[PDB]
Structures are given as C-alpha cells and as structure tokens.
C-alpha cells in the first residue's frame, strides 16, 4: 500500500522496522523541495 507501506514476512527484526519507519520521512521529503 502507498503512504508508509506495511508487509511483514520471514525476515523482519526490531531493526528492519526502524529502517522501514525512517524511510517514510524520506519518501515524503522526496515530494517536497527535492523530487526524485
């Protein structure tokens, strides 16, 4: 799904989650001043 995706599999620790949660703040900014 768009806007902070969520799909747990068989390879997700308490760290992969921080990497997944700290990615939304980048994807959102990727539509602000900077554009991919």
Tab-separated table of C-alpha atoms in Angstrom, residues 10-21:
chain	number	residue	atom	x	y	z
A	10	UNK	CA	10.022	-14.032	7.444
A	11	UNK	CA	12.960	-11.536	7.723
A	12	UNK	CA	11.864	-8.560	9.914
A	13	UNK	CA	13.586	-7.701	13.237
A	14	UNK	CA	13.228	-4.743	15.664
A	15	UNK	CA	15.893	-3.014	13.425
A	16	UNK	CA	14.424	-3.587	9.894
A	17	UNK	CA	11.341	-1.828	11.367
A	18	UNK	CA	13.334	1.347	12.276
A	19	UNK	CA	14.732	1.281	8.684
A	20	UNK	CA	11.113	0.930	7.389
A	21	UNK	CA	9.732	3.682	9.730
